[PDB]
Design a protein around this ligand. Structure first.
Ligand SMILES: COc1cc2nn(CC(=O)N3CCOCC3)cc2cc1NC(=O)c1cccc([C@@H](O)C(F)(F)F)n1
Length: 282
């Protein structure tokens, strides 16, 4: 962890080249992600930008304060920052296999993830969330776009800008993933569990949480329909796998179903989610 010149980051990203492969790797609510090389190391550079006011500086310090000295197997690693130039920048260890969202959608012609790799990714993500909840942190934006994958497809939770240590007026997050109480402005770790429930649906189905062109448009409505015997999980299992067995899929769905209880107090805690995912692969 150290301070970077805005001009070093500007330089190694080809003046923040917004063309894909180019240097642009992705885009979120709070900025663009660029590929760069500093200190003999390939890095991800998030240039923060707005909705969000000067609150983007508050998410900048929030993430630095939370991640500056954090090391977990299943959390992304912050290498440093830049605040000496035009825009706020965060520099991370490069995740060569990008986001779970992008790998589930097979963006850029990447091969589909096997059920084996999907099970390991779910366990890792839950281990990442468990670490945060143990340290009395709430993520507030758990989704497939915020689960990154390293050179061994190890799951790394990312984007701690909205993380906290309760009601609020400023309601923020991705609505396709957000628990009902989180939409009303509640801040609780139980909201993170609900969101993880949706990530598990993405993993089982390979479908995005929201699709404008889909009936139904929200993936958590497909879950509701399965529970009302209007559909079966078997009909929605991702066709792009050869190694998926009914038992382990149905076991993961069971975890996702428990996570997606609309009443927060009925949902399992992260420790219970971890255990049920372990018994899935045993
Ligand atoms: C959304 O971000 C990324 C997208 C990417 N795409 N790729 C290419 C890729 O995945 N391919 C597969 C192999 O074949 C070529 C295509 C690597 C990517 C890496 C990305 N992110 C990070 O490395 C990273 C690390 C730490 C923290 C963060 C986030 O907090 C941030 F900053 F992005 F918001 N991101």
């Amino acid at each position: 962890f150290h301070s970077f010149s805005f001009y070093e980051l500007k330089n190694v990203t080809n003046n923040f080249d917004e063309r894909p492969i180019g240097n642009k790797m992705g885009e979120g609510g709070f900025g663009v992600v660029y590929k760069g090389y500093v200190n003999n190391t390939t890095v991800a550079v998030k240039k923060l930008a707005a909705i969000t006011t000067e609150e983007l500086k508050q998410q900048f310090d929030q993430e630095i304060k939370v991640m500056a000295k954090c090391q977990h197997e299943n959390l992304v690693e912050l290498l440093g920052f830049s605040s000496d130039g035009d825009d706020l920048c965060l520099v991370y260890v490069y995740m060569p296999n990008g986001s779970l969202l992008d790998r589930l959608s097979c963006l850029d012609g990447t091969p589909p993830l096997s059920w084996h790799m999907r099970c390991k990714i779910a366990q890792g993500a839950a281990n990442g969330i468990n670490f945060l909840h143990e340290n009395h942190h709430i993520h507030r934006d758990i989704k497939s776009a915020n689960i990154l994958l390293d050179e061994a497809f190890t799951a790394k939770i990312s984007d701690f800008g909205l993380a906290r240590a309760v009601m609020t007026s400023r309601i923020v997050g991705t609505t396709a993933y957000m628990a009902p109480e989180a939409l009303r402005g509640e801040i609780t770790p139980k909201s993170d569990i609900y969101s993880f429930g949706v990530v598990l649906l993405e993993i089982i189905t390979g479908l995005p949480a929201v699709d404008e062109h889909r009936e139904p448009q929200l993936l958590l409505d497909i879950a509701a329909a399965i529970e009302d015997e209007e559909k079966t999980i078997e009909d929605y299992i991702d066709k792009k796998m050869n190694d998926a067995d009914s038992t382990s899929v149905e076991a993961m769905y069971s975890v996702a179903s428990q996570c997606l209880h609309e009443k927060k107090n009925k949902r399992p805690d992260i420790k219970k989610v971890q255990q049920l995912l372990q018994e899935m692969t045993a």
